């Protein structure tokens, strides 16, 4: 089973941390040395990691029963969540450095309710299947992340979507986190797929893989033949190669920026195409060259 990526332009694909269209590629700020996203994580041979689901219909969603004080969580289909499986139910939002505003609906009832989530207090323990209701009345709900705002705590914090929330309690740590992802070095930096997030600011949500890449990899389960997959970002209309990238087994892409000539300067309507398997230290040409 040869390795492939979907033959679809990036700008028609979805973020994997929220049901949002991809509008650009980007890199992390210099002071972001690593990420540990829990959604949008899938190895190149198709193993889902963290809380990543196959389908965008699960992404950035919660389900549980409120009693007025806490919401006791389940998986999105209603089956029980067990802490040893991950840091939260599958698809649970993983946006750190922000308050969440989740749109709550119910099967069999009329109306939608906004659920405002501060992810810092000792009642926010999704790893134990329990988060504060914050005024959400009793009942069973499905919620989807709708918009974000600056964290309520610490006061004065900015929105910072390079973070993940604290999933554990003030005493017990969330287990089975997806591992961190680091830049490979020697010029290669992580490539992120960006989406505009509604909220009272110019919020941009980064993710490591488009959601459609994830369900493709989960379906294909192509054996990871080499240490890295050399790819071309090609123009769909001409086939012209716009730059070399590497995809790594843990499930992320890199390039060598030279800079106002990084992946953000490339068009967003291009297609990633697998070229061959290469060594970890295969030296990429700089973007633009």
């Amino acid at each position, epitope marked *: 089973r040869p390795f492939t990526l979907p033959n679809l332009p990036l700008s028609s694909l979805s973020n994997s941390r929220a049901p949002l269209p991809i509008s650009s590629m980007g890199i992390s700020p210099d002071n972001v040395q690593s990420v540990q996203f829990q959604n949008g994580r899938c190895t190149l041979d198709g193993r889902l990691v963290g809380t990543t689901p196959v389908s965008l219909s699960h992404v950035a969603k919660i389900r549980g029963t409120s009693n007025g004080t806490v919401i006791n969580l389940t998986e999105l289909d209603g089956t029980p969540f067990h802490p040893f499986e991950g840091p939260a139910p599958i698809g649970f939002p993983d946006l750190g450095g922000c308050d969440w505003h989740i749109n709550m609906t119910q099967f069999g009832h009329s109306s939608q309710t906004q659920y405002d989530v501060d992810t810092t*207090p000792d009642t926010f323990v999704p790893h134990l299947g329990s988060i504060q209701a914050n005024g959400i009345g009793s009942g069973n709900y499905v919620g989807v992340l709708s918009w974000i705002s600056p964290p309520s705590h610490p006061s*004065g914090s900015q929105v910072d979507l390079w973070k993940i929330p604290n999933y554990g309690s003030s005493i017990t740590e969330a287990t089975h986190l997806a591992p961190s992802v680091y830049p490979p070095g020697f010029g290669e930096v992580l490539v992120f797929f960006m989406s505009k997030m509604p909220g009272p600011g110019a919020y941009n949500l980064p993710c490591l893989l488009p959601q459609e890449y994830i369900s493709h990899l989960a379906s294909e389960q192509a054996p990871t033949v080499g240490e890295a997959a050399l790819l071309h970002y090609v123009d769909p209309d001409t086939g012209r190669n716009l730059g070399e990238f590497k995809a790594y087994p843990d499930g992320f892409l890199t390039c060598v920026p030279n800079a106002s000539s990084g992946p953000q300067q490339l068009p967003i309507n291009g297609v990633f195409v697998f070229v061959s398997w290469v060594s970890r230290f295969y030296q990429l040409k700089p973007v633009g060259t």
Partner: antibody
Amino acid sequence: QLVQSGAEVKKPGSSVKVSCRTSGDTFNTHAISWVRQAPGQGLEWMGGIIPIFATTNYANKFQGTVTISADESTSTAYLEVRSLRSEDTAVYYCASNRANRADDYDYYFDYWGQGTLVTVSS
Amino acid sequence: EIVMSQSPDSLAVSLGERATINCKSSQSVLYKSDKKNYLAWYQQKSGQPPKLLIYWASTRESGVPDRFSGSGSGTDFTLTISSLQAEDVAVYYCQQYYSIPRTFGQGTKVDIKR
């Protein structure tokens, strides 16, 4: 240690500007809040400013009629209250709390001014 | 906003007896990251600005007589005057400084019972 300006009488609909001066050390290491207290009532936080970062915030009910400012050269914070009504008759307190960064000022109140009485009446 | 609720509204306790004042916050003020409760207690006598008694829920402010103590965690907090003295007649307020806006309880008036 927080020195407030004198009592004021204002007619309904007018505006009042109340000052709070402190030492320069306190001014550049603290957030300066304004807390008011209607006669025989509780304490109501109106808003605050961190002078060295020039960031402000306000409680929802005082948004639009209240502005809080700071003068770095005189170490003085100001509270301006427009569209005054009778229910705005209160003692307006200046209060400080530690502020190490723009996102690191979640601290209990440090000092209090002696208060400034604002009587709104005809 | 985090709403602070105190109980009782007023308290009358005989000299040398213990006064307890409860405070509940509508949302936990216990930051998981540092394990601190962002809660303070103040004393206000008429004509005066409030005075800090307790901070971080249980830490006694320097100069406060040690018959003042604070306890509780998360959403439920308690101020206790273990042996009330005449100079403690005042209004007591709890306050969260976890988030903006800062909010106080409605206050609890403590008088000497006779």
